[PDB]
Amino acid sequence: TTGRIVAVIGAVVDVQFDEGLPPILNALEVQGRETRLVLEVAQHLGESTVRTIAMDGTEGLVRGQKVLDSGAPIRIPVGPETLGRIMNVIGEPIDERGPIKTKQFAAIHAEAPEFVEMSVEQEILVTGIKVVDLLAPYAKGGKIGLFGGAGVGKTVLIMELINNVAKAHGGYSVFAGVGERTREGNDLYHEMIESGVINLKDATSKVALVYGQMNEPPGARARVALTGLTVAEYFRDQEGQDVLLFIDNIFRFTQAGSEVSALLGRIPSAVGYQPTLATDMGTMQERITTTKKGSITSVQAIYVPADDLTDPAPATTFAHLDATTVLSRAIAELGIYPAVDPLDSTSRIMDPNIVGSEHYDVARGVQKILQDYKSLQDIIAILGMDELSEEDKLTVSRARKIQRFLSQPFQVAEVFTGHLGKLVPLKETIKGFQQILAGEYDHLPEQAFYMVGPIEEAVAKADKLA
Amino acid sequence: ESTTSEQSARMTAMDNASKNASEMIDKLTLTFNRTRQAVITKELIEIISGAAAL
């Protein structure tokens, strides 16, 4: 149909249609534009006017300008042909390697899998990261969440997971860049090309890329997550394959939404956010799941505004995950990396019937001594450790050794740690912490446990220290 | 030897403990003033949102 822009306010554009008003979620096409400018119908204002959200900048738009109804929501290219390419919210290619020829085009708007489609197979996903594997194990086909304040370690943790999980993976991988750093997209792209995971010649690429970084207007950042998820949906279903979905950073979806929600005319909810925050988030995260038809292991980085974990965004995401890895600025500052909070990172898999009694018990022992130490922190603070019970000194000492043994040198982080990357097998992780708990290394200096792999290196570093 | 040592030690211990308390006071004051400001702001924005929604 043919409509006319009757109002433009940043990313929100109102279009008036004489006949055949376009339904909600329908992608409209602005006419008289060099590049494709899509407007998604968000609501029907009445008087034959619809309120929409632009997927690109609205500069240059004039009142009266013509808009066509495409007849359907934003549809993108889905299929193997997306592997090794990079697209934007609206599915166009942004790698300068020409068109994306697919048979199928899926809409980025799909209803979530039904309750009868849900899977319930609990299976551990060993990452080789001591802290995660011990305290809050990830699961295959489960939902993993990396929480973190600015600069704390989310992106390095995701890249380390890609390196450990994705590499040794039989299946396709989808990486959605959402409101983050374009230059990280370029690094990712070239890193993937160099490794051979993105082959620009053979048809052997295993990763599909989708980006909408911090350089995009709100409307595009609010939908890129849906775009890369739609690509992951196909591989999951239309191919019955184990898909991996990495998103950095999913918070940017919610933040994109607050920016337009104001322009959409809604009364603001707590902290200035859109009153639809949780439902917007829900209809999207419910699509990011494993189904009986296929499995998707998702890893989403989640930005924590002002480091406040109670902020509506991060707070609402907790219920969408099966395992959480919560990163702390204070932990990072102590030099511990990855800066995981051992007392705030949880997992539904952390059950004696799943990870077994030996693993469950050591994890619980580690957390008990960390919590007990945490209690003494205040007392240590004022009077130091000399007016401390000989009994408590020992908890403190072990805790500090456990606290340092939780740290690990990552490949991706080699330049910052000054240490070779390590990948520790679950069995070795359990043993290391068992032994420290048992007081077997009450004679080694804490420092020996810092930045190593298996406990064996701790001992070897202790001798090195003389 | 005992009395000298003990007093040296105690002097040291209390000197350090008052220093630690000082730093903790400074840090708590900062937190107090961040919270005091966020509270003012937060209460005010509730008033405006309510007012504006009429």
């Binding site: 009077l383 000399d386 007016e387 000989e390 | 003990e6 030690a9 105690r10 040291t12 211990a13 209390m14």
Partner: peptide, 14 residues
């Protein structure tokens, strides 16, 4: 609150 006076002597004494 004598710093670590007491602890030292007691440990080496027993």
């Amino acid at each position: 609150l004598c710093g670590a006076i007491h602890s030292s002597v007691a440990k080496q004494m027993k």
